[PDB]
Motif scaffolding. Structure first.
Motif, PDB file in Angstrom:
ATOM      1  N   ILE A  58       0.839  -1.196   0.000  1.00 34.73           N
ATOM      2  CA  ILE A  58       0.000   0.000   0.000  1.00 34.73           C
ATOM      3  C   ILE A  58       0.877   1.250   0.000  1.00 34.73           C
ATOM      4  N   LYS A  59       1.920   1.268   0.836  1.00 35.60           N
ATOM      5  CA  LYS A  59       2.827   2.416   0.850  1.00 35.60           C
ATOM      6  C   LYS A  59       3.430   2.658  -0.529  1.00 35.60           C
ATOM      7  N   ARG A  60       3.893   1.590  -1.183  1.00 39.22           N
ATOM      8  CA  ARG A  60       4.476   1.724  -2.514  1.00 39.22           C
ATOM      9  C   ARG A  60       3.466   2.285  -3.511  1.00 39.22           C
ATOM     10  N   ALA A  61       2.191   1.912  -3.382  1.00 39.46           N
ATOM     11  CA  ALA A  61       1.193   2.416  -4.322  1.00 39.46           C
ATOM     12  C   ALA A  61       0.973   3.914  -4.138  1.00 39.46           C
ATOM     13  N   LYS A  67       4.697  10.275  -7.120  1.00 40.27           N
ATOM     14  CA  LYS A  67       5.820  10.386  -8.043  1.00 40.27           C
ATOM     15  C   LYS A  67       5.335  10.770  -9.437  1.00 40.27           C
ATOM     16  N   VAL A  68       4.250  10.153  -9.912  1.00 41.50           N
ATOM     17  CA  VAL A  68       3.791  10.466 -11.262  1.00 41.50           C
ATOM     18  C   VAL A  68       3.183  11.865 -11.313  1.00 41.50           C
ATOM     19  N   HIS A  69       2.632  12.355 -10.202  1.00 35.52           N
ATOM     20  CA  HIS A  69       2.084  13.707 -10.150  1.00 35.52           C
ATOM     21  C   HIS A  69       3.076  14.723  -9.592  1.00 35.52           C
ATOM     22  N   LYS A  70       4.364  14.369  -9.555  1.00 29.64           N
ATOM     23  CA  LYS A  70       5.364  15.130  -8.809  1.00 29.64           C
ATOM     24  C   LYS A  70       5.325  16.619  -9.123  1.00 29.64           C
ATOM     25  N   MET A  89      -8.662  -3.805  -1.884  1.00 27.93           N
ATOM     26  CA  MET A  89      -8.530  -3.229  -3.214  1.00 27.93           C
ATOM     27  C   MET A  89      -7.503  -3.998  -4.037  1.00 27.93           C
ATOM     28  N   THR A  90      -7.701  -4.003  -5.355  1.00 27.07           N
ATOM     29  CA  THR A  90      -6.617  -4.389  -6.242  1.00 27.07           C
ATOM     30  C   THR A  90      -5.602  -3.251  -6.317  1.00 27.07           C
ATOM     31  N   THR A  91      -4.377  -3.593  -6.715  1.00 25.26           N
ATOM     32  CA  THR A  91      -3.351  -2.569  -6.881  1.00 25.26           C
ATOM     33  C   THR A  91      -3.784  -1.527  -7.908  1.00 25.26           C
ATOM     34  N   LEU A  92      -4.479  -1.959  -8.961  1.00 27.84           N
ATOM     35  CA  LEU A  92      -4.998  -1.010  -9.941  1.00 27.84           C
ATOM     36  C   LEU A  92      -6.002  -0.062  -9.297  1.00 27.84           C
ATOM     37  N   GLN A  93      -6.938  -0.617  -8.516  1.00 28.39           N
ATOM     38  CA  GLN A  93      -7.985   0.189  -7.896  1.00 28.39           C
ATOM     39  C   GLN A  93      -7.416   1.200  -6.913  1.00 28.39           C
ATOM     40  N   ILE A  94      -6.298   0.878  -6.264  1.00 32.10           N
ATOM     41  CA  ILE A  94      -5.706   1.836  -5.340  1.00 32.10           C
ATOM     42  C   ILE A  94      -5.421   3.146  -6.060  1.00 32.10           C
ATOM     43  N   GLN A  95      -4.916   3.064  -7.297  1.00 29.26           N
ATOM     44  CA  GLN A  95      -4.574   4.273  -8.036  1.00 29.26           C
ATOM     45  C   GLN A  95      -5.806   5.122  -8.322  1.00 29.26           C
ATOM     46  N   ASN A  96      -6.925   4.497  -8.694  1.00 30.47           N
ATOM     47  CA  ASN A  96      -8.117   5.288  -8.985  1.00 30.47           C
ATOM     48  C   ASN A  96      -8.752   5.810  -7.697  1.00 30.47           C
ATOM     49  N   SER A  97      -8.709   5.027  -6.614  1.00 34.14           N
ATOM     50  CA  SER A  97      -9.199   5.545  -5.337  1.00 34.14           C
ATOM     51  C   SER A  97      -8.383   6.753  -4.889  1.00 34.14           C
ATOM     52  N   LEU A  98      -7.057   6.679  -5.015  1.00 36.00           N
ATOM     53  CA  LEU A  98      -6.223   7.813  -4.634  1.00 36.00           C
ATOM     54  C   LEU A  98      -6.533   9.034  -5.487  1.00 36.00           C
ATOM     55  N   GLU A  99      -6.676   8.844  -6.803  1.00 31.11           N
ATOM     56  CA  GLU A  99      -7.027   9.962  -7.672  1.00 31.11           C
ATOM     57  C   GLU A  99      -8.320  10.621  -7.214  1.00 31.11           C
ATOM     58  N   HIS A 100      -9.293   9.819  -6.779  1.00 38.50           N
ATOM     59  CA  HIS A 100     -10.560  10.376  -6.328  1.00 38.50           C
ATOM     60  C   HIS A 100     -10.367  11.229  -5.078  1.00 38.50           C
ATOM     61  N   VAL A 107      -5.286  19.057  -3.631  1.00 38.43           N
ATOM     62  CA  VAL A 107      -3.831  19.057  -3.740  1.00 38.43           C
ATOM     63  C   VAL A 107      -3.376  19.371  -5.162  1.00 38.43           C
ATOM     64  N   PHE A 108      -4.297  19.812  -6.026  1.00 37.19           N
ATOM     65  CA  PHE A 108      -3.992  20.115  -7.425  1.00 37.19           C
ATOM     66  C   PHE A 108      -3.540  18.856  -8.157  1.00 37.19           C
ATOM     67  N   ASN A 109      -4.069  17.707  -7.745  1.00 46.16           N
ATOM     68  CA  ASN A 109      -3.700  16.442  -8.355  1.00 46.16           C
ATOM     69  C   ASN A 109      -4.668  15.318  -8.028  1.00 46.16           C
TER      70      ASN A 109
END
Length: 109
Positions: A58-61, A67-70, A89-100, A107-109
């Motif tokens: 989870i930390k790595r995700a 990093k990608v929004h640096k 969550m799946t690792t993929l879903q973590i990214q979309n949950s974080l984006e939400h 945070v402008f991201n």
């Protein structure tokens, strides 16, 4: 300064003086820091979610997301806390949950 928040005293100032939002998987705190001119990130993942292998995934995700929004993140102190449903969550879903939730956190991201 480093981008990672480490000191426990910083985690506390942010919780006390900062502002929070949350979706089902993550709580996000933000707090301006006039003495810094780039964002900083602290991460909290409780042992209630699982063992060290799960928590580090989870930390790595979360780190890969910032990093990608640096270059398009505002200069605030930011704490991301994983909630219990993050463990499902799946690792993929973590990214979309974080984006939400990050979009909700302004945070402008």
């Amino acid at each position: 300064k480093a981008y990672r928040i480490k000191k426990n005293a910083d985690f506390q100032r942010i919780y006390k003086k900062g502002h929070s939002v949350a979706n089902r998987q993550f709580v996000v705190y933000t707090c301006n820091n006039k003495e810094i001119d780039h964002f900083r990130l602290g991460i909290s993942v409780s042992k209630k979610l699982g063992n060290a292998v799960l928590r580090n995934k989870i930390k790595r995700a979360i780190r890969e997301n910032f990093k990608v929004h640096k270059s398009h993140i505002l200069a605030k102190d930011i704490i991301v806390i994983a909630r219990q449903p993050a463990k499902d969550m799946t690792t993929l879903q973590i990214q979309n949950s974080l984006e939400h939730v990050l979009k909700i956190a302004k945070v402008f991201n």
